[PDB]
Ligand binder design. Structure first.
Ligand code: SF4
Ligand code: SF4
Ligand code: SF4
Lengths: 292, 134, 439, 292, 439, 134, 292
């Protein structure tokens, strides 16, 4: 609490809980216990869903906080066809504790990250992982002979729009949301993009990312492309996708297809264990060379 | 949610019901207390309705639960007890009425009902609780 | 008198000791699913060294893979005047094929320089090598099962004068009662010949060429998993649905039996299903057997027709790693990784597989896990009636919903006359070749 | 279920559970829920015992399945003097799910191995470990300087009846089922069989295996033999035992007492750790020899 | 049908697997208190060796500390006739300062004797070294992030003829978005000069002298803990309350993120508080914020105003130990211990911290733990009302009693509208300099 | 907390209530045991009030729960049973009165109330338990 | 039980539990279930406190036994201002099982060590750790370059009263029980005792041990001394403390301040890891010296 102590030290208090979650898409959602729709920021908290607010826990230790936050799913609300397709994953929340008589008397209990959401029986139950969720994970590179970065990354900047690299064409023939026909296949090499981002920016799957595989053009530039996984929302054979090119993350495929061999961030040579414990025999090749 | 009808006219003597609050409470163990209210309103929470008429009234009452009921519809409720205020304190009630004139839209608090036969034409059912969902 | 807070003590031991009686791991558990508890598996051996103690266990392997061996019956150092020994290094058990390409401590020694006598370790009980007539015939050991390699008059001159750590490429054919029926190459060939000849060169079509040099060794996955249950004693083992090539797996002695098998369940992904008492090992696919509508589920325990759990975004394994063995060149520990382009910000989850496989295959496997572990976030927890009890424990359910029609492979069937299911989300397109280029 | 789906898809069904366990001895036992004795194979399932059938579990993982299978013990049944003595250990079951109206409409739920049996209060409770019990155990040889196999084993075949090796004589003087007098002691060496199989093939302990120790003949070929453990069933001083000879599992005892030194399956020399890190000093004995 | 004793089985998995999802260690747990579960942390690396495999992870460090590095791109042995190589040893990631004082296997080699070309590993993407024109420009690797050190025409003559294990003193400045704002020495100095000169000598006042040789490297504790959360991705990190010098911490790759940070929570003792979404990292003090009387606690769950637990005497950690790094001389693993004079009879509880710090500081830290772990025996378990909810999760309560008036820092706040607290006893005088003499 | 009114005058025969003492207790299994209380007062803890009048009294009674009530307000309570002392022992009561003349400010111990209709004009509600929060 | 079996084999028995704990101070406390004060030794067991006696457990394993022993705290009893300050830590108990009709018919159930005491709600709950509490702990020395022993220890005997080393002076100016003014500061060096025993032998904290730090004399021999931790009982500005001198546990501070450099029990030189894998280069200093 932040200077509502004058309100709070009195036994007569009226603090009704309320929270907003910001999805990965730009829209937020509103939730409150107050039973009347209220807002203080431009969020318009709705008591139509959400809000059981069960027992936020704390700890000086790096372990996260948690709140299961039982609620309801509906057409205005999360609606669960949105949730199942792949949204609300890294959804960021702030829980508030507003005075409903005066919403300028509020604070934040925690800012969470909403890890595990269990929906069932016409309702949803969503564990609010704490601020320290990212700690507790392994991050590192292991000197492997491929590359290590994605295309947009700072360790390999590319300017991914710099030429006719991206395929901007609108989609037809979505079939089972893994096969995609694509009317405008023609314009690129066969098997040009094999590990790319199928960002779909229109229609049902709005701003949803999949990964391509099997970039094959069968006849007259069809370019039938598979994906690893379902998009989770069916594209409607009229959506617009853009596909960034595919990186095999290998030195040969780096420098040939792309110009950016300088920004490699990989470890091509990496001699081996048997080199390390080897003592130099004075036989055969012992002049300076590639060792490859 | 409907606006269909009030109810069958008959209600037995004992149709109980009054407003609710959550108002969770800590009871500070070494002195007085402090307690919070998140409502600003009250669920009227009417209970213990009883239909008592002939069996001609029963078939329009069992399908009252069924036809316009299902589970999730209104059937505006008549109180034997547009904004109404209560001025008998210097505080105020100021409680809204979405429906006109004490009509308090509700829903039945039952997975099933239980109508009984008391005589050749007597139809009885002991309780139909409601909570007045908005 | 009352009871203490060893009510918490009697809740554990043996209150929970009865459970695991009747029952990096960061990515091992998600690939098996809810499934069962993934046992610690395959800390891959780098710097293979030979320890001459008495407490090391007998290794086992299937196919072309280097193994360290250990010293049994070394004679005293013999000075010619500048040393000489008579080693015998015991590699692995069972009848093997021949041992070629010996390399000691360091790079490589030519086997023509050695005087080694390889032995198959035949159950036929090969006699004494007669180099152990140093000991004499009356105490000459005559090893039945194990496949030892003696070394004769070995000059310790080029590698110091100490004994060097020898490492041996070994080819071992998969054995067992299911293996002698249905013979694959290693005896099924029954004379191939047709050496192409017709003599730096044209090996760019070796991965697609008809000739079978090198890859004739690799045993089918059907008989190696049959060898495990044969050595464990399960002869009721059913394995006709398996389609894979092993190419040099290696687990040591006292590797739990199942933990050696569990590395294969990560690579080839197969079910280990056990519908009936046959313990059917079928390869995992998306072939849907159920086609449930939402109207056709039973009333569960939690009184929800389908409880659907979506796992945390903070733990999705954004990048996955392996520790396979090189399997073409000098057998060395390598690593590839697959990185998902949107969320590369963290969650590295790697594991180590002790088998040997090529370069395009390893990037194929890690490309398969990173897709699967993000697909297998969704789990379903429903109950289906015993009116259709023929949903075996490893089948996959279509599960029509009003919103989605998402498939689900099932685990942890607990029925008692009401089949209650912990499913997991599985797509069909995960189980495909990645079609990548090679090294 | 195997083609009883026509019976099962109807809500009117009548499938009564039933199972048979095959003991280590050749006899089987029958159990059913149907409350009337029924059979389909030559097993004659009895509803007099067994059969509570609580909650068979499953798993794609290598972990076993389980069913506690509460029941009753009686004179026709397991009877628990049979169970305590050492029978029903590796007892193999099949659980069935038969139609009692027509027993040709059946399947197997699982084929189990009945690991843990807890009997008490006039009843028994027997955990049915699943098909995968053998997986999860350690099997291996550790290069130890003894032998590694038993006498009958394939790794050391012996033809254990090939001469006067086995002692076939009938038993007298059973005492406390550890000491055994044996009327026909005479016929063999003193301390001939020290690790052998005391298979007792008649009477109470029928086909029960113990291990011998202290093969001593005190007077006129008595041959008083101890055992490690109780047989669990008292022999009646008239039973017939046969005792295979004792193997010390050592190269000297192998080749002297037995001829089969070829099939050794052991590791006699096995130099040692201190040999391995030793560098060759050029002093003292450095000529080729036994190193023993 | 009924259920078996896998009711104990479903009580564990996943009955308790849901917990640690949403959540020597002998002394690690007491210092964090009830707190949270102390993750395994900092098995200190002694005999730093360089392994040339492909499965070792990229190390990270902050300040003057030796790191092993590993081999990437070694050419073949070149005989002059008596050997020569062209190594490249990759130390750590990020832009670093220069690498001085190289010592191989054994004591010391003079860097003037070498032909090494150090590289910062700049995100600016340093070009090829041109010693990799052995490979040629078309396949020359050009490492962006990692800071490799090549070695040119290295004579393998003085150390055998094998490759020796090289170990490198590395100075790395703390980076990250919070570090570039608020610059400390390592770029904040912006030209110091004033070299005292005026030439065994008078170094007895070096620990108190104004000149900044050596200790100019050491990064403030504020930015290093900011670098951790920056690499983990938490940019909302709040760290203005931290006051410490790091002087060469080192955690490896895949060190969980937090387990690298948790070693600092033992050394400098700071809260990692998280009042709000800022995750405030404040240094722990005894500054009392609450002043509760006994009359002002709420009614708890167990219906006791204050449950006070005093831990066992048999487990009080009578003597505490460290495994710090020498940080002034040749960086080697050392150990100091603090022994309580009355009860020295047992309970040794030691832990290992992989950072580098001096000699009087290590005896200061272990002198602080042995006092704190005996102070933190007492824990309190009370509930306070939401009338004063501004007691954040890491604050400290005066807690007036009829008998004592003993302070309590709090942990594990679980409120739901009734703030229930597991406190722990904390005194103010624990957090002071010990004022000890040096080595 | 209010100073609004006493209550509706009517209270049925059976309006029970008496002081409630924390009385934290140890109950040694040996025998005699010690105890202590942290109040130095006693919550009076009145229960079982009943309103019984016409339906004209009911609408000023149901909103008595609602308007100045909510949950968390005073409504000073009249006892049919400034410092009062009790001198019938040689000990003393010496219990304070914040309000004048036995008026004991309270709150109802209910999330909801339940008013019943027993005849054309009869209004009943069975219980309104209070505890006199300071 | 020890020869009360004649009393105990009869169903008519009357054995009432009772126990005595001996504190670290010389006084004992008495506790009984019998509801009448009884004694057999000079302990005078009081039923006014203690004694719920819940479920002593046992084990052949080295793991301790346990008994939570719920009871009451009072002014005659433990009183909890005694307990919180640091007493009752290594308190040794014996639980007895006496006949109240004849207290010469008794035995010991176990002799415990009373590890964890949880007091609350006007009562206390004290886990009685078993006889084997000391096993299960780490004891050892780690070759560290300091000393390893305390001053009174057998490994370094000192005769701590041998001269004007100890400061016997009575206390004034106790302040917040960490700062202590001490009227008689003068008599010793500045910063003489920095790791010593502040044994306070009078008043409230009777025989209570703290550790000193910051031995500084500000003016005219004040000698303001801090402590690491609170004493837990406030001294009353009239108590008598004695402070043994401070040992830095270092060779230089050993031999200079104290004479006892012989009884060092420490490891000063301890070369290092880098010495061990070092091979001797034939350059620079290779003559015999300190290596320091
Ligand atoms: S190939 Fe080039 S662009 Fe592609 S990931 Fe590797 S470094 Fe980045
Ligand atoms: S001594 Fe011979 S017969 Fe006996 S176990 Fe050993 S190998 Fe087998
Ligand atoms: S300095 Fe001397 S007296 Fe002090 S602890 Fe060390 S050995 Fe004992």
């Amino acid at each position: 609490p932040e200077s509502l102590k004058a309100h709070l030290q009195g036994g007569v208090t009226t603090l009704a809980r309320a929270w907003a979650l910001a999805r990965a898409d730009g829209r937020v959602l509103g939730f409150t216990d107050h039973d009347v729709v209220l807002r203080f920021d431009g969020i318009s908290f709705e008591p139509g869903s959400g809000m059981t607010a069960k027992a936020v826990l704390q700890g000086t230790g790096l372990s996260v906080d948690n709140t299961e936050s039982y609620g309801a799913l509906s057409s205005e609300a999360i609606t669960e066809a949105d949730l199942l397709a792949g949204r609300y994953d890294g959804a960021a929340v702030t829980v508030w504790l507003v005075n409903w008589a005066d919403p300028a008397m509020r604070a934040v209990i925690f800012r969470g990250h909403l890890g595990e959401v269990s929906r069932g029986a016409g309702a949803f139950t969503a564990e609010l992982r704490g601020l320290t969720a990212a700690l507790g994970q392994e991050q590192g590179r292991i000197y492997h002979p491929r590359c290590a970065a994605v295309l947009g990354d700072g360790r390999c900047r590319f300017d991914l729009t710099k030429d006719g690299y991206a395929l901007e064409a609108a989609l037809g023939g979505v079939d089972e949301a893994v096969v995609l026909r694509l009317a405008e296949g023609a314009g690129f090499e066969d098997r040009w993009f094999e590990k790319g981002r199928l960002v779909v920016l229109d229609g049902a799957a709005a701003g949803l990312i999949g990964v391509v595989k099997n970039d094959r053009l069968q006849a007259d530039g069809s370019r039938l492309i598979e994906l690893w996984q379902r998009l989770g929302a069916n594209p409607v054979a009229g959506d617009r996708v853009r596909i960034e090119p595919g990186c095999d993350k290998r030195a040969g495929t780096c420098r040939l297809k792309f110009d950016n061999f300088l920004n490699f961030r990989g470890f091509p040579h990496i001699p081996g264990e048997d080199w390390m414990v080897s003592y130099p025999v004075q036989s055969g090749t012992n002049d300076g060379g590639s060792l490859f | 949610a409907f606006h269909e009808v009030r109810f069958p006219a008959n209600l037995s003597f004992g149709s109980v019901g009054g407003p609710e609050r959550r108002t969770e409470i800590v009871t500070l163990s070494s002195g007085h207390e402090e307690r919070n209210s998140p409502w600003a309103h009250s669920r009227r929470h009417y209970d213990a309705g009883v239909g008592l008429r002939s069996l001609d009234d029963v078939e329009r009452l069992i399908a009252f639960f069924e036809a316009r009921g299902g589970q999730l519809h209104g059937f505006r409720w008549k109180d034997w007890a547009g904004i109404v205020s209560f001025n008998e304190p210097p505080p105020q009630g100021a409680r809204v009425t979405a429906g006109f004139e004490f009509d308090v839209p509700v829903r039945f608090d039952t997975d099933r009902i239980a109508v009984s036969v008391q005589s050749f034409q007597a139809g009885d059912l002991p309780q139909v609780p409601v909570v007045e969902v908005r | 008198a009352t009871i203490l807070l060893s009510a918490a003590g009697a809740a554990i031991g043996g209150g929970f000791g009865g459970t695991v009686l009747g029952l990096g791991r960061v990515i091992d558990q998600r690939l098996l699913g809810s499934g069962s508890q993934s046992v610690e598996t395959g800390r891959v051996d780098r710097l293979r060294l030979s320890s001459a103690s008495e407490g090391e266990a007998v290794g086992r392997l299937w196919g072309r893979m280097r193994v360290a061996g250990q010293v049994i019956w070394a004679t005293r150092f013999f000075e010619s005047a500048s040393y000489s020994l008579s080693l015998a290094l015991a590699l692995c058990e069972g009848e093997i094929l021949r041992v070629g390409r010996v390399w000691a401590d360091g790079s490589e020694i030519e086997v023509s320089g050695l005087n080694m006598r390889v032995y198959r370790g035949g159950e036929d009980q090969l006699p004494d090598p007669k180099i152990a007539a140093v000991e004499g015939a009356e105490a000459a050991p005559a090893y039945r099962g194990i496949a030892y390699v003696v070394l004769e008059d070995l000059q310790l001159a080029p590698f110091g004068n100490r004994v060097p750590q020898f490492t041996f490429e070994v080819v071992r054919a998969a054995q067992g009662a299911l293996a002698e029926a249905e013979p694959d190459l290693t005896r099924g060939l029954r004379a191939v010949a047709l050496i192409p000849g017709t003599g730096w060169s044209d090996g760019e079509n070796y991965a697609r060429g008809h000739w079978i040099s090198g890859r004739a060794v690799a045993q089918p996955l059907a008989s190696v998993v049959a060898e495990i249950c044969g050595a464990a004693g399960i002869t009721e083992i059913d394995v006709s649905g398996l389609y894979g090539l092993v190419r040099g797996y290696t687990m040591t002695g006292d590797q739990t039996g199942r933990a050696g098998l569990q590395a294969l369940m990560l690579a080839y992904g197969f079910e280990a299903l056990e519908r009936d008492g046959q313990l059917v090992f079928r390869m995992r696919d998306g072939r849907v057997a159920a086609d449930l509508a939402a109207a056709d589920l039973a009333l569960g325990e939690g009184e929800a027709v389908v409880e659907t759990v979506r796992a945390a975004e903070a733990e999705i394994a954004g990048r996955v790693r392996l520790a396979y063995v090189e399997a073409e060149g000098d057998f060395e520990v390598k690593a590839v990784e697959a990185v998902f382009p949107d969320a590369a910000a963290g969650a590295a989850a790697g594991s180590e597989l002790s088998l040997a496989l090529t370069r395009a295959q390893a990037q194929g496997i890690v490309g398969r896990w990173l897709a699967e572990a993000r697909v297998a976030r969704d789990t379903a927890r429903f109950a289906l009636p015993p009116s259709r009890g023929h949903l075996g424990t490893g089948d996959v359910v279509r599960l029509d919903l009003p919103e989605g029609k998402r498939r689900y492979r099932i685990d942890r069937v607990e029925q008692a006359g009401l089949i209650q299911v912990e499913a997991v989300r599985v797509e069909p397109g995960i189980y495909a070749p990645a079609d990548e280029v090679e090294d």
